[PDB]
């Protein structure tokens, strides 16, 4: 019965891909084309995002998929998935923008009776009123997250140990893809938070995202060598620095960027404190917090920030790994899976330029 | 005629897909369970009145914390599912699914659904669970969880035998109307 289930599964892979590609086609031909006469280019871009790229990629994917399945033993099927893994990274953009697209579609349709009526017509023409455009826009998110499931099942059914091994490579690829799409969404959300912080800070020396991911922000009292008594400050902790600011109205003026490459943590109201001190430096800070609970929370976040700058195994096996923002699709030198997200995705060895995930540093072959 | 959005959430392999396929097609999918349930829309008669029921599977999304919630906005009713022969999936209802669903959708009705009813009584399944130091979830236990999370109702069903299946979706629709 295992072989029967194997062949059913192969057929489902093809049939569901055909249906999906046709759904993308229907969006393009029954909704996009007609709505161009109703919506400004700006509106079209916001609502449909990169659906046309998805249609182009999947049309070709489907052809290669059908070719693989028609070949003896479907032995090249795993290659098609692996081949398209990086092409499918376009889902990063789609899934990061689909909420905004859906929101904007609802807004235009509520504002404009003629658009609402056209949408009802388009739905009727496309699918007999079964599915709204708003619903259809979620189908791509659904699809990209089916691939790992279909492959997981295929692996289970086939009794061919060679085919199992090859398909496991494709399963790994589609799980990797799904994680990448998830991390792109997370990074875009984080970047929105960073942009909002940046707009409220005055006198920044550089883009705030250069400092990495936000950890914690809030009120504290600080003493310095240059200023001995407790002064009220507002701080933003990111991976690479503590940005000490003074609240001026609704904005924050940057007074000091404390570089965490150098500075290390040494352990009533406002008495709860720890030191931020440089290894051999002339400058040291005392950071005072309102409560013990706030002190604990900040110390924990400082630990996380420093762990990102100086991860376990950063200098293992001759390497010198440092936080790095990759601007092109990149694979980890240890595990061969993709670096995930849109900025500070992992590490790059200063010496040999090997890219690696934080978790993989000790497993990269010697420098 | 409103298009009532019902979204099915829960751990993988509690048979969310099986449940949806069995209901929408009536017959049990057979010995091959398809992996894919695409969004479905059809008229159902509940208490003398026609209702347009939209059904959404979430299979494949469970491990992806930022993508998972994309399914939630504008949902009219959730089915939060666990398998009666998987205590781990039952625990994830309180630990993962209910709190996430409640956060994104403060006011949306929840139905708590115990799946694989046919297997709780199955000799071989009782054996392999006992083997793993496990025991199936009982009706009072399921009912208690439903009260704990403030579910509208607790229901048990079998995709395979279709026992209690029509009731699940009838009650989902009633919870909205
Ligand atoms: Zn190196
Ligand atoms: Zn790696």
Curated annotation (Swiss-Prot), chain A:
GO CC terms of this entry: cell-cell junction; cytosol
Parent-protein start and end of this portion: 190 to 564 of 845
Phorbol-ester/DAG-type zinc finger segments: 318-367
Tissues showing expression: Widely expressed in hematopoietic cells but not in other cell types. Found in the spleen and lung.
Name assigned to this protein: Proto-oncogene vav
Domain PH, residue spans: 213-307
Superkingdom as given in the UniProt entry: Eukaryota
Gene Ontology MF: a single term: phosphorylation-dependent protein binding
Domain DH: 5-184
PTM entry text: Phosphorylated by FYN. Phosphorylated on tyrosine residues by HCK in response to IFNG and bacterial lipopolysaccharide (LPS).
Species the sequence originates in: Mus musculus
From Swiss-Prot, chain B:
Stored SMART domains: RAB, RAS, RHO
Outcome (variant: residue 71 to A): Loss of AKT-mediated phosphorylation and FBXL19-induced polyubiquitination
E.C. number: 3.6.5.2
Keyword Ubl conjugation: yes
Regulation: Regulated by guanine nucleotide exchange factors (GEFs) which promote the exchange of bound GDP for free GTP, GTPase activating proteins (GAPs) which increase the GTP hydrolysis activity, and GDP dissociation inhibitors which inhibit the dissociation of the nucleotide from the GTPase. GTP hydrolysis is stimulated by ARHGAP30.
GO molecular function, one term: protein-containing complex binding
Assigned keywords, A-Z: Cell membrane, Cell projection, Cytoplasm, Disease variant, Glycoprotein, GTP-binding, Hydrolase, Intellectual disability, Isopeptide bond, Lipoprotein, Membrane, Methylation, Nucleotide-binding, Nucleus, Palmitate, Phosphoprotein, Prenylation, Synapse, Ubl conjugation
Impact upon substituting residue 56 to A: Strongly reduced interaction with PLCB2
Record GO biological process: actin cytoskeleton organization; actin filament organization; actin filament polymerization; anatomical structure arrangement; anatomical structure morphogenesis; angiotensin-activated signaling pathway involved in heart process; auditory receptor cell morphogenesis; cell adhesion
Enzyme class: hydrolase
Motif Effector region per UniProt: ranges: 32-40
Description of post-translational modifications: GTP-bound active form is ubiquitinated at Lys-147 by HACE1, leading to its degradation by the proteasome. Phosphorylated by AKT at Ser-71.
Record-level GO cellular component terms: cell cortex; cell projection; cytoplasm; cytoplasmic ribonucleoprotein granule; cytoplasmic vesicle; cytoskeleton; cytosol; dendrite
UniProt note on tissues of expression: Isoform B is predominantly identified in skin and epithelial tissues from the intestinal tract. Its expression is elevated in colorectal tumors at various stages of neoplastic progression, as compared to their respective adjacent tissues.
Cross-link position per record: Glycyl lysine isopeptide (Lys-Gly) (interchain with G-Cter in ubiquitin): 147, 166
PROSITE patterns referenced in this protein's UniProt entry, alphabetically: RHO (PS51420)
Membrane topology classification: Lipid-anchor
Its biological purpose: Plasma membrane-associated small GTPase which cycles between active GTP-bound and inactive GDP-bound states. In its active state, binds to a variety of effector proteins to regulate cellular responses such as secretory processes, phagocytosis of apoptotic cells, epithelial cell polarization, neurons adhesion, migration and differentiation, and growth-factor induced formation of membrane ruffles. Rac1 p21/rho GDI heterodimer is the active component of the cytosolic factor sigma 1, which is involved in stimulation of the NADPH oxidase activity in macrophages.
Name of the protein: Ras-related C3 botulinum toxin substrate 1
């Amino acid at each position: 019965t295992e072989y029967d289930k194997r062949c059913c599964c192969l057929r489902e892979i093809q049939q569901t891909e055909e249906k999906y590609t046709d759904t993308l086609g229907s969006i393009q031909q029954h909704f996009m084309k007609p709505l161009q006469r109703f919506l400004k280019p700006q509106d079209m871009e916001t609502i449909f995002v990169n659906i046309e790229e998805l249609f182009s990629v999947h049309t070709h994917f489907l052809k290669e998929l059908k070719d693989a399945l028609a070949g003896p033993g479907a032995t090249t099927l795993y290659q098609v998935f692996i081949k398209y893994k990086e092409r499918f990274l376009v889902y990063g953009r789609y899934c990061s923008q689909v909420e905004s697209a859906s929101k904007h579609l609802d807004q235009v349709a509520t504002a404009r009776e003629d658009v609402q009526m056209k949408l009802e017509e388009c739905s009727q023409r496309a699918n007999n009123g079964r599915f709204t455009l708003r619903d259809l826009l979620m189908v791509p998110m659904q699809r990209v997250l089916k691939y790992h499931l279909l492959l997981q099942e295929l692996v289970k059914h086939t009794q061919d140990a060679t085919e199992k091994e090859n398909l496991r490579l494709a399963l790994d690829a589609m799980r990797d893809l799904a994680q990448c799409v998830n991390e792109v969404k997370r990074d875009n959300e984080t970047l929105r938070q960073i942009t909002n912080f940046q707009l409220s800070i005055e006198n920044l020396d550089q883009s705030l995202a250069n400092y990495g991911r936000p950890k914690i922000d809030g009120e504290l009292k600080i003493t310095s060598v240059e200023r001995r008594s407790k002064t009220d400050r507002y701080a933003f902790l990111l991976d690479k620095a503590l940005l000490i600011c003074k609240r001026r109205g609704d904005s924050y003026d940057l007074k000091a960027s404390v570089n965490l490459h150098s500075f290390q943590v040494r352990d009533k109201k406002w008495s709860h404190m720890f030191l931020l001190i440089e290894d051999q430096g002339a400058q040291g800070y005392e950071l005072f917090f309102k409560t013990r609970e706030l002190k604990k929370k900040w110390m924990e976040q400082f630990e996380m920030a420093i762990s990102n700058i100086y991860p376990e195994n950063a200098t293992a096996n001759g390497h010198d790994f440092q936080m790095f923002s990759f601007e092109e699709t990149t694979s980890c030198k240890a595990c061969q899976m993709l670096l995930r997200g849109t900025f500070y995705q992992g590490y790059r060895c200063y010496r040999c330029r090997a890219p690696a995930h934080k978790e993989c540093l000790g497993r990269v072959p010697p420098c | 005629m409103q298009a009532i959005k019902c979204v099915v959430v829960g751990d993988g392999a509690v048979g969310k897909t099986c449940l949806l396929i069995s209901y929408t097609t009536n017959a049990f999918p057979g010995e091959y369970i398809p992996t894919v349930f695409d969004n479905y829309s059809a008229n159902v008669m509940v208490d003398g009145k026609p209702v347009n029921l939209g059904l959404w599977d979430t299979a494949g999304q469970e491990d992806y914390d930022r993508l998972r919630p994309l399914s939630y906005p504008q949902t009219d009713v959730f089915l939060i599912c666990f398998s009666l022969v998987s205590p781990a999936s039952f625990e994830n209802v309180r630990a993962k699914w209910y709190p996430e669903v409640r956060h994104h959708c403060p006011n949306t009705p929840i139905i708590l659904v115990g799946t694989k009813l046919d297997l709780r009584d199955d000799k071989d399944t009782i054996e392999k669970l006992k083997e793993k130091k496990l025991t199936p979830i009982t009706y009072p236990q399921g009912l208690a969880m439903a009260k704990e999370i403030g579910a509208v109702k607790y229901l048990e069903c079998s995709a395979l035998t279709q026992r209690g299946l029509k009731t699940v979706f009838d009650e989902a629709i009633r919870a909205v109307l």
